[PDB]
Design a protein around this nucleic acid. Structure first.
Lengths: 123, 121
RNA sequence: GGCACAGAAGAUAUGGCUUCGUGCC
């Protein structure tokens, strides 16, 4: 209850990423299940540019593939990172619109097909 | 012609392909002035080793104020970089897809992008 | 020379870029 988390729902299941590191710049959430190697991990950071005219949100989801013939071992890692440029004097509506448009984009079957089957966008 | 349709509430935005190369495509919302049209750029490439693919997706949103003559004030962007291992299971790829679908839909992520509120509750 | 790197920093984004690091021919 008291560790901070982000909870991801995939259909009927939910997957809780527990915060394992927090610094002024950066945050790391990891899923507390399974082998200690290759746990699902979310790295997130917020940063201003030198001019203080824009922000950069970085989010990075690392999904490792662990095989366990004896003791566990990460075979490979697949990653989906995000890089969001927010302008400091932007209207809130402009940021909500970017968010709304991306939530829709990622939710499309076309983007599912691209990532899962390498099928080009456009129908 | 080729399109992708995005749905916000009861509204839709139709992005239409205006360009393609062997490994890149550019979609715009072909509505209104040419100034500041919503744009999606999509790329697919291989590893140096040919053991992985990188998918790049980038949404550029200009802020246009139309007081007679349109002008871009600023542009905000949300880009994605996806690393897909070549020999991987469809299940593992679909899982990463679903986890990210869910990640972006969280109100924590909205709070981050819209209000700069750090993640974790 | 050429190439690799989910190495680091910068960039409101042809961000298919720049610089720096490390490694392979």
């Amino acid at each position: 209850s008291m560790s901070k988390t982000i909870v991801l729902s995939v259909g009927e299941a939910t997957r809780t990423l527990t915060e394992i590191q927090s610094t002024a710049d950066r945050q790391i959430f990891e899923e507390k299940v399974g082998p200690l190697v290759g746990r699902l991990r979310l790295t997130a950071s917020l940063r201003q540019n030198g001019a203080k005219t824009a922000y950069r949100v970085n989010l990075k989801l690392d999904q490792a593939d662990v095989v366990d013939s004896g003791l566990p071992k990460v075979r490979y890692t697949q990653v989906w990172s995000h890089d969001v440029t927010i302008v400091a004097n932007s209207t809130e509506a402009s940021r909500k619109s970017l968010y709304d448009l991306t939530k829709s984009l990622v939710a499309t079957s076309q983007v599912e097909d691209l990532v899962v089957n390498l099928v080009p966008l456009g129908r």
